[PDB]
Amino acid sequence: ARIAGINIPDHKHAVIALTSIYGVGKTRSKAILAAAGIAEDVKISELSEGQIDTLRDEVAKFVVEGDLRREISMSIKRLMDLGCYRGLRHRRGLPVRGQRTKTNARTRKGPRKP
Amino acid sequence: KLTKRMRVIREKVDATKQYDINEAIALLKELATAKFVESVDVAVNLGIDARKSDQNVRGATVLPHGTGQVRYRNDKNGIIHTTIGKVDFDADKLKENLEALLVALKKAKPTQAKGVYIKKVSISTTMGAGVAVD
RNA sequence: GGCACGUAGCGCAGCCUGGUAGCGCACCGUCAUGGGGUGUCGGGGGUCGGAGGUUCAAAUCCUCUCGUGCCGACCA
RNA sequence: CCCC
RNA sequence: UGAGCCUUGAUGUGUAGGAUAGGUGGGAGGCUUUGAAGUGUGGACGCCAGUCUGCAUGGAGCCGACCUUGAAAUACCACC
Numbered sequence: 006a007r008i009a010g011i012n013i014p015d016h017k018h019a020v021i022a023l024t025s026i027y028g029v030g031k032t033r034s035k036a037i038l039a040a041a042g043i044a045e046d047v048k049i050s051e052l053s054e055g056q057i058d059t060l061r062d063e064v065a066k067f068v069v070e071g072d073l074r075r076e077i078s079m080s081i082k083r084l085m086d087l088g089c090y091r092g093l094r095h096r097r098g099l100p101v102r103g104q105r106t107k108t109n110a111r112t113r114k115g116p117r118k119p
Numbered sequence: 120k121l122t123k124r125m126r127v128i129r130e131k132v133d134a135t136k137q138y139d140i141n142e143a144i145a146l147l148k149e150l151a152t153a154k155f156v157e158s159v160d161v162a163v164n165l166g167i168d169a170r171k172s173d174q175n176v177r178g179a180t181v182l183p184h185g186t187g188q189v190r191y192r193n194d195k196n197g198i199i200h201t202t203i204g205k206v207d208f209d210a211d212k213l214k215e216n217l218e219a220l221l222v223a224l225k226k227a228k229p230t231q232a233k234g235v236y237i238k239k240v241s242i243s244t245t246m247g248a249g250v251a252v253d
Numbered sequence: 254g255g256c257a258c259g260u261a262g263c264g265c266a267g268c269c270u271g272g273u274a275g276c277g278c279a280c281c282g283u284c285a286u287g288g289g290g291u292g293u294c295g296g297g298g299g300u301c302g303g304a305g306g307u308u309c310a311a312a313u314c315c316u317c318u319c320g321u322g323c324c325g326a327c328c329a
Numbered sequence: 330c331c332c333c
Numbered sequence: 334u335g336a337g338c339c340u341u342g343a344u345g346u347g348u349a350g351g352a353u354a355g356g357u358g359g360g361a362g363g364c365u366u367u368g369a370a371g372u373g374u375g376g377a378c379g380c381c382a383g384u385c386u387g388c389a390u391g392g393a394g395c396c397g398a399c400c401u402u403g404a405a406a407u408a409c410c411a412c413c
């Protein structure tokens with residue numbers, strides 16, 4: 006409801022909230038609840054802050070949204086300065102999850118212009 | 120269609136006979152038929168075409184006896200609604216009030232008037248049949 | 254002065270009869286074919302000639318102007 | 330509707 | 334047989350939102366037995382959604398303000 010200062014994953018299980026968090030998904034939610042000592046069957050609107058601050062600290066160890074995109078941009082700067090084939094593919098503004106682009110890359114290459 | 124209230128008031132007047140100012144304050148006693156201080160509305164039917172932005176009115180008139188500084192603005196079709204007071208506000212003094220109102224409108228006469236400035240003055244009652252004077 | 258037209262590239266409704274630019278053609282790409290046409294299907298294409306006001310809103314109200322037209326007037 |  | 338015109342009849346789904354509400358525009362008492370609200374129906378319109386009125390029974394109660402609405406009531410009155 007208040008972890009990260011910005012996100013309000015209200016009405017979400019102790020782990021569903023962490024999965025809905027920006028920065029981490031399925032596994033780090035469980036890792037956090039395990040390293041902090043909480044169950045994963047109750048929403049966040051029942052837990053007091055004496056534990057929410059601990060969850061906040063426990064998540065403050067990995068990269069966060071404010072630094073997630075920064076690390077991503079750093080990798081992108083590395084690519085663009087290297088000029089590698091991947092850097093060129095990225096600088097041409099094309100979809101990004103893999104290798105194949107010719108006839109099925111429409112998902113992030115958008116629809117057809119002509 | 121109605122009760123003994125509205126029919127007598129509407130037959131105590133005449134729509135085709137445009138009364139004068141002096142006789143205008145002669146029947147408001149019978150036209151005032153509310154158990155309070157009922158007002159009397161006034162309408163100035165004007166003789167211009169207000170469809171142009173050039174022909175708007177705006178001002179404030181001083182009531183010579185109060186109701187006293189009342190604002191006014193014209194209409195788009197040429198019928199401006201204003202008021203003078205109530206029916207028991209010394210009917211004889213209602214004519215004196217009317218006198219001070221129209222003298223400020225003839226003075227406030229805009230310059231872009233096309234055709235006749237004024238057409239009619241309907242001194243109508245709030246709970247009865249109105250009257251139309253020149 | 255007096256009135257009648259400007260709407261995608263073309264011709265048009267809407268009109269220059271209020272609330273929310275559409276019609277056909279033209280063009281592009283599929284489908285219908287054994288192959289085509291016609292056809293559907295979908296998509297680009299315009300802002301209402303220009304400007305200004307009335308409007309909870311204009312295009313569909315009012316003023317002026319632009320271009321093009323018919324009528325009419327016009328004895329430095 | 331036309332054509333092979 | 335067109336046009337004009339006094340009078341009256343009568344108007345005007347936007348959406349919104351109690352609601353076929355044209356601008357204004359002043360405005361709380363109209364409303365009532367020269368014979369209620371509820372109902373009987375016929376009629377007019379109808380974007381038929383609702384306005385709508387004849388003689389009624391019912392037979393004397395409803396409503397403006399009240400409330401969110403582009404706007405307010407269409408209590409009455411206002412000239413179109």
Ligand SMILES: [Mg+2]
Pocket residue numbers: 098099100106110113114
């Ligand atoms: Mg690509």
